[model samples]
Target: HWGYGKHNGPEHWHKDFPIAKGERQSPVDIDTHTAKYDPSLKPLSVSYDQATSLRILNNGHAFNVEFDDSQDKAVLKGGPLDGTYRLIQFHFHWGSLDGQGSEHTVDKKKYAAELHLVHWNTKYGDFGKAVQQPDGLAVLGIFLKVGSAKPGLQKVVDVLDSIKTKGKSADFTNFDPRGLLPESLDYWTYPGSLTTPPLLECVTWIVLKEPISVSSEQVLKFRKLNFNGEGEPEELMVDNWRPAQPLKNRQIKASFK
Candidate 1:
């Protein structure tokens, strides 16, 4: 199975998934000083309805909070997008130790964790068909720094114990995804692919410059998540991140200077 293991890691992904070596790979190092600031980029819009949140799932890889995106109950627009995009789910990437898990780095400095709010363009009707096109998805990325305990994340963490093992699911509603966001919307935009398997180059990556704070203990909860299901040989879910890929020739656009 495709995973973060040494044999199945990113380096060997191209053996089975050829496009893993595609030019538009994701999780690139964000060189802020060199990122081009284009004032023409419109301000982003985010509207995540608490009622739209469905449940949480741990699919042996990451813990994801899914939403009812069949309709436009939650959508992202304006910034680096052609039409409205629907929020499908949100997940995270982390490491075994603190301050070393984030996929994208700022000036080569990585954060304690990173959250991805995944969305798909409604133009193609749904995620299935939308992901087949180049401009079919937009992912809002929020970096999480280690610091004070995060009330915004505590609710989600509280349910982790219930979903400790892989394939586990939990009922999670009345929670607004916006609580995980930072105060500023300033971001860097780039055309990239999915960080996981199949590695589709269909995402417009909108990474915010500001990072939210989370406690070290809160990050520890993630480390306790078991990749293997109940009664199976357990594997600690840590260092579940892909190393930053090459930037190639694509431009990194900034919303602010």
Candidate 2:
């Protein structure tokens, strides 16, 4: 029963979910100067099968493009992860205004939006089983900057009209999510949780240093989606992002020098 309104927004989450104040909470502000270089960290390798894409849904929260993870048809390896992880879904978080939206900020700077590609460790058997383990999940975070219109994102935008309300979904298959990646894969690795609640502290966050571009028009389309279901009063969905949490005693490892 939570939405991003002033009554139930991020600040109020700690009341019900105490882990919201946990040491390893996610979407932390990455101070590039303090991030230590780890030469041992391997370059990330991702291979996503277009055919494995399942559907796109607006689930009263943020929209997600789900994938069939029954097998390793789509996978992510290397980087800060120790073994292979299967791609399950990907989603976005943005704000009401373009100037400040992203969850994880770089040098205290916010981007227009953020993309989260969720993968679960193969060793854990399945997403449900893996979600409770500290190293069982690896999420690739890509920041979105306002610039030229992105063709990959445009495909998603074109369908926004169909899923304009919560609980609405559409058959979105054969789409290659790889087309959404940036030119460089340089990243900062940290230990964090889902920016959203239940706020599980199970994810190994690998947020890319480079950001992909999206037009102002494309982002506005996302705002059109409703936070309420079809029968409920319409409430425009915006500012779905959680603010960056404390760094605590944790350290960020950079792949670049």
lDDT of each: 0.91, 0.91
Alpha-carbon runs more than 4 Å astray in model 2: 49-51
lDDT of 2 by residue, 1-257 (tens): 77799999999998889999999999999999999999999999888754388799999889999998886688889998899998999999998899888999999999999999999999999999898999989999999999898888888898889998888999988778888899999999999898888999999999999999999999999888899988899889999999989989899999999
Model 2 pairs whose backbones collide: none
* Clashing pairs counted in every model: 0, 0
Per-candidate TM-score against the hidden true structure: 0.98, 0.98
TM-score of 1: 0.98
Q: How do the residues 32-112 of candidate 1 rate in per-residue lDDT, one tens digit apiece?
A: 899999999999988775438789999998999999886668999998788899999999999899869999998999998
| C-alpha RMSD (angstroms) for model 2 | 1.0
